[PDB]
Amino acid sequence: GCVEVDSETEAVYGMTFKILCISCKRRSETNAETFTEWTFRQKGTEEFVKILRYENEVLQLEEDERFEGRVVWNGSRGTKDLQDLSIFITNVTYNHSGDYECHVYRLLFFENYEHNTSVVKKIHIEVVDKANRDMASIVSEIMMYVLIVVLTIWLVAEMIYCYKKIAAATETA
Amino acid sequence: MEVTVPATLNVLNGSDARLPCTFNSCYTVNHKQFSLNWTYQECNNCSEEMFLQFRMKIINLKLERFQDRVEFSGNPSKYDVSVMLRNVQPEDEGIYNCYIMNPPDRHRGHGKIHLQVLM
Amino acid sequence: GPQSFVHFTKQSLALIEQRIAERKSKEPKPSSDLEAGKQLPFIYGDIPPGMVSEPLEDLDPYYADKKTFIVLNKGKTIFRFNATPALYMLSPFSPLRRISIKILVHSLFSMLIMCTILTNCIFMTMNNPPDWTKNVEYTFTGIYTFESLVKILARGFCVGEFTFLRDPWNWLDFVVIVFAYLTEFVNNVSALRTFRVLRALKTISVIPGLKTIVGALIQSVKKLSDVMILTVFCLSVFALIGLQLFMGNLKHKCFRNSLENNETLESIMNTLESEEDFRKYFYYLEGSKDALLCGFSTDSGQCPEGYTCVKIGRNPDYGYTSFDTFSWAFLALFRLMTQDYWENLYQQTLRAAGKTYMIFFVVVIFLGSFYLINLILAVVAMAYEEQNQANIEEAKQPYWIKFKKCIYFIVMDPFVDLAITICIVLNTLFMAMEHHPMTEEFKNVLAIGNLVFTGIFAAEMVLKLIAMDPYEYFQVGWNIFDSLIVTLSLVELFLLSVLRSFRLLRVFKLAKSWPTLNMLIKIIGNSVGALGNLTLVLAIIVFIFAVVGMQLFGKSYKECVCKINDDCTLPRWHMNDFFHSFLIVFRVLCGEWIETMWDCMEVAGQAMCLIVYMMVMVIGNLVVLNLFLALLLSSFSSDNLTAIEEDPDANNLQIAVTRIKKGINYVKQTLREFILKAFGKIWWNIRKTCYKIVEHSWFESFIVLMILLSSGALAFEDIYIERKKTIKIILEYADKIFTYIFILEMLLKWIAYGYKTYFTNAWCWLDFLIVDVSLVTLVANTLGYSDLGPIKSLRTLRALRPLRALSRFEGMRVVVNALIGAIPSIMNVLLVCLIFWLIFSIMGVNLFAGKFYECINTTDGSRFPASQVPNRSECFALMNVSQNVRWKNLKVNFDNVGLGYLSLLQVATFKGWTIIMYAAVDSVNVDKQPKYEYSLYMYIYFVVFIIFGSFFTLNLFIGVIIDNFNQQKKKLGGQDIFMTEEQKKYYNAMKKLGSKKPQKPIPRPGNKIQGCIFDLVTNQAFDISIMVLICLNMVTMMVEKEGQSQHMTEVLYWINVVFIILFTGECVLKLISLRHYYFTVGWNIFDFVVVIISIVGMFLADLIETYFVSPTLFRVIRLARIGRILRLVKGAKGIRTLLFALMMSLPALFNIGLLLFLVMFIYAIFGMSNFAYVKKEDGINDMFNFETFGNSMICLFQITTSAGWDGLLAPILNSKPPDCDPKKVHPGSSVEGDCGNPSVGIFYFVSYIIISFLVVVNMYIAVILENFSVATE
Ligand SMILES: CC(C)CCC[C@@H](C)[C@H]1CC[C@H]2[C@@H]3CC=C4C[C@@H](OC(=O)CCC(=O)O)CC[C@]4(C)[C@H]3CC[C@]12C
Ligand SMILES: Nc1[nH]ncc1-c1cc(Cl)ccc1Oc1cc(F)c(S(=O)(=O)Nc2cscn2)cc1Cl
Ligand SMILES: *[C@@H]1O[C@H](CO)[C@@H](O[C@@H]2O[C@H](CO)[C@@H](O)[C@H](O)[C@H]2NC(C)=O)[C@H](O)[C@H]1NC(C)=O
Ligand SMILES: *[C@@H]1O[C@H](CO)[C@@H](O)[C@H](O)[C@H]1NC(C)=O
């Protein structure tokens, strides 16, 4: 239904990147009206500045040079009940490195009861020249190869031992 | 609705008359919705006079023909809507009706009492 | 001998009195043949004409001394009376008593009483009788008074021996008469009329052979004393456990956080009456009458944002579902034992307390639901066996002539009968082609085919009737049945919808050659034949319960209707009239009683409805079980004796088969003749070392561990796999390693065994197929073929890799061997019940095809009335006007034969059947809006289907499965078929445990004080006092309830502490007296462990409750208090034997449970693969779905008992809009669409429920075998 998956923390210069922000409401059958706001604090800077605000199926982009013409919407479409607030970067530059905040303002409609809640998600993005391969993949691949090698040498040694023993037994008879 | 009333009630002049009216309803009597009407008519084809009604609480209309001699003598929560006529006079002779509506019961209850006053 | 017949005269009475006087001055069983109510022996021959129905002298020498006289009827029935004058007036020689006796023994008397009772029973079904009825009631009363007076005058009243009041069945007549007169003279009307149902019980004493059936039913109960005690004890123990664990959990509700006008929870809760006002402060799901449950743990139900979980308010289901007091907990545990709507309670408890508490429900189901029911069936099985064994044991101790002969020659056994059989098969296949969206040409073809078949069958009937004489024709029952079918078809041709389905019964004509269909014919024939009286008793009991329920609660349903219905109209199930009251009783017999009992308790109070429902459940289930058992055993052993040859008269099918064996073989041989006329030690050492490698124990352990690791890695691939990147990559590389390992293992087996040996083994074939699928998947992924549709679908086949564990574990191997050996016998009965269900499916298509469509308002999901929108065209016009309007059909219906099969499967399992019945009884016509109970009497269709294809079909299946497993045991020497060799050794060792000779008496200590304590503890009064102390402790635990004050909690805890101190003192005294001999008894070891855990647990619970904050830990640790009450089974010998039988059954149950767990694991992996993204409607929701492995196991354990499988199937039947959205976007995943696959889902659920049925039947049979061995050894 809805799974909250964290964003990738590494983007490569010159290509595209998607920043993931998923905010699933606690019960799926409830009806809500959601809008989101994104703030970004670049490396070497302290103040979070607003970069975009998505509401009513339209994206409002702030007048920022580092994001003008470079951000498109990648979240939930065709509804006011947004559970995916992701954005998409078309041309990653070194100015997109820093910390992002994904403010989710969800208004839930109940029987004679309106609840205005809010969620904040923080994403750290580092812009690099080349895609650094994950440690998990490298370690798992190396471990797989060494495990296969160990198993095959163990089996080979056991076969040679048994073959020598049975050949000696045959020669005895 | 089953309404338990005496068909004929003979009460001495000057004495107190209790007019019993009880109903057997499945549902609990909700005071915020229980309705009770006590009317009086001189004859079966005569006009009915509203003198004691329960809309939210006991409302006694204080009719001039009864002075202040009409009192409530029942308990709606206990299915008893009886009324009391203190110091019954000869003019009190007539027909007394107790209308009962106890939602969500669909049917309307109606009991009739013929009060006769002897010397 | 026969000459011993003489009128009873005054001289005979004088001689008898003189003999009695001689006996008195001086100061043996009678002939069972001459016993009253029996046929006079044939040794006496006929009776003189002037001697019948006259007071005669006593024949029996036993009563020849006392004063008696016997009257014999024309039917040679012996009736014994008392020579003492009736009420000291009427003597046997008096004309008045003579006439009374003459009336008493006659056929027109009993027949008149029968007719009167039946007419009164018919009149009893009226709920609002007219005013002309009272005269008929007075006539009924007068008729009964007539027979009562006749019996009193003839037999005397009370003083004598064979008088009116000595017979227990005349007490019912006297009670009826006195009640009728007393209540008539005194004048609750319902109470008085419920007493009139006792007249329906006079049916037992008038129809012959009913009293013996009732006596046998009473006898069967007396053998159930120990099983009922054990059931009550187990239910009480589990009710205490549930009370301790789930107390107050069902009161949790989602209460809103923000309140205006300075409001607080207590201030709200005392000003709320209606559910409309409750819905403004608590969270309700749409269309629900109870508030949504919640919990405080992370694995419980979740409240929406803006609400907080709090324990407040009433319990669900009008408040009748709770674990708050011992009584409600006991009701809940009884509901769990009977598995009546238990999935609802299971879901509520998991929502309110957490998914971890599924362990409680698994244990409860296994012990109470499965094992306790097992003992009930087993004990009744032995009771009827011993009754059956005793029964047989005491029983043994010109031109017209020419052309008729020409036609007779035309009727050939090899050809005409085979042609007729082929025509019957083609006909039943032809009517299986009917379906709702059927064009006019197809209907024309079906009609002409049906007419042609009818014409041919009529021609056959006419030819057979004119060939051999009509008098000879109607001698054979099959000919009569064929004639009835033909005339019914002709009557239909001259003209209902049901009558068109009467030509389905010609399929039963194949039973002449089909032997297992003839078994079903005999089973059905016996129920109405040799067992007709038992079926009649069952029918009478059902009728009595229906009329009693209607009289007691019928007006309560009408007056109190608004409590159980928002529209203030009668619900679907009620007792206002006789038909619906009978439907309620039938549904209770089917196993569903809790939901109607809630409404009954709401409209009429708890006590009366509880008593009535419990009585109905007990008596009805007992009688149904007795009928089932008698049918099973009769048709199993008594009917089959191989009296005649296999088709003693050479079967026409067999003669035709012999003719075919001649003809085809001869023609083929002649065709062949015409064609002929026209025209290297090293490799052996390698094989040996590979063999030595594979066969070793370390290799087997390594492969087993690889199988377990590879199977467990499947459970991690859920919808949350994207939150676990590292584990995902690790699992991919581990899958590569596993594929490599199993490929190497396959190669080693190939070298060691050779292709011939490897491919003659079926387990090796399974491993080969699995490894080839894995290798194809691995190769496809590497060469870029990873997202192809067939390749992606082939990836889901990895869920079959746990099948590699079947060969490795011996228990699953033996259980699979048993199932595979069972398969051949199952298939024939499967074909029989498929034909039987095909008949009902064709009838259902005839009745209901295309009539379940309705115009509903989608937002609230309610059917529109029939005053507006009475047609499909009007529905489409309404859609043109209103948006939320849909002309919707049921997913499971009778549109075609396959859907009819699915509907019949749902009805037979009673899961989702009620919706089908409502649709069927609201049916009007095709493209017509349904009306409420328009076709009300189509409930008869479902009742008949249940009775035949659910009761008799299961009867046949069990009957054949018994013989199959009996044959399986015999061929292997009688050993247990569900057990391994080491399990057999441990089984024998445990057998020696339950048969030990009384051990040596415990040496007495020489010390004075020690010796006195020894005599004190050894005495039986000590053990009895300990038992009553345990009972008092049980009562003390029963006192505990929800919401009790802290003072009461402290008092109960201190009483428990006193009990613990007393038990510890008992243990210390036993230790002092018996010294080291105390530890030589297993029960003493159990008691020692119990007292230790009691003390430790009480102190730990105190520490947790005061110094810690852990209610869950407190409630879990408090379970050690159960050990004290488990010692009650020490004194109870019968329940101890039953528990010994259970522990005997445990190993085979362990093997079958392992197989079931493996099947559940495979189906769970497939469920997460397939149904993880379906819409959350019906039985699928936020907590019970296929998103994770745990949720899938939760769902599959529930449907192992078949509970709620329809609700899980329903969302997967969605395949097209607007039912589902094929382009549904799921955040956090690339999967698109919330649609299910109807074919895959149907196959999934049907196969799972069938396999669960087979495995559960295995568990039943195993437990039965251990119980039967224990009770008769
Ligand atoms: C072992 C015995 C008991 C059963 C042997 C199978 C046949 C006797 C029956 C069972 C299922 C039947 C089928 C069930 C459903 C259909 C679909 C039906 O067509 C539709 O439903 C079309 C619907 C549409 O066009 O909208 C045509 C007949 C057919 C193939 C039936 C043909 C006859 C079948 C194969
Ligand atoms: N807390 C309290 N109030 N009043 C007396 C006490 C008390 C006094 C002492 Cl000296 C020790 C502990 C005490 O507390 C208990 C005593 C019990 F007996 C049970 S028990 O009935 O559940 N029995 C049981 C067996 S194993 C787990 N529990 C539960 C508890 Cl908390
Ligand atoms: C189906 O239902 C409608 C219900 O109104 C049937 O009645 C017709 O309704 C229209 C619109 O109200 C009227 O104008 C017609 O006069 C009604 N028919 C007649 C004969 O009076 C309608 O006939 C039904 N159609 C079908 C196909 O059964
Ligand atoms: C995200 O944006 C890219 C670039 O415009 C587009 O191709 C893609 O379809 C979008 N995906 C979603 C989830 O909207």
Ligand SMILES: *[C@@H]1O[C@H](CO)[C@@H](O)[C@H](O)[C@H]1NC(C)=O
């Ligand atoms: C508390 O309730 C009172 C009414 O009893 C109200 O007058 C007052 O304003 C409330 N105060 C708060 C803190 O809401």
Ligand code: NA
């Ligand atoms: Na039910």
